[PDB]
């Protein structure tokens, strides 16, 4: 939200901004709500997130080349 750092910068540095939320408000307020997307993307999204872990366990078995 607000970064200060007295005078050892000489740069804008939007570090804590992007560390707090920053864009997380814009992504939801720019276009129409669309009553459907939540359902959709909450599900699809996390399902694929679980696949990476599943990938971790299934990629180390053989691979003998």
């Amino acid at each position: 939200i607000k970064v200060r750092e007295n005078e050892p910068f000489d740069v804008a540095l939007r570090r804590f901004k992007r560390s707090c939320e920053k864009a997380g408000v814009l992504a939801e307020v720019r276009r129409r709500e669309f009553y459907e997307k939540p359902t959709t993307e909450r599900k699809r999204a996390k399902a694929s997130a679980v696949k990476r872990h599943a990938k971790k366990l299934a990629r180390e078995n053989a691979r003998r080349t």
Partner: protein, 65 residues
């Protein structure tokens, strides 16, 4: 892995904020359940603590206006 909502028995009230200023980000946000490893149930129970802290002005909605 914390002795908060596993060994810390019986709902953690928001009165002792000397621990809740560790759960909120220095602004007013909440730290995901995938960051500070706690069971989703009590992250909602801590969500009840932070919610009433926002209703009794101990933990605001955000840092400043």
């Amino acid at each position: 892995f914390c002795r908060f909502t596993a060994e810390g028995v019986q709902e953690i009230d928001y009165k002792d904020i000397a621990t809740l200023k560790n759960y909120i980000t220095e602004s007013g946000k909440i730290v995901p359940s995938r960051i500070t490893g706690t069971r989703a149930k009590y992250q909602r129970q801590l969500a009840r603590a932070i919610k009433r802290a926002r209703y009794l002005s101990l933990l605001p909605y955000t840092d400043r206006h």
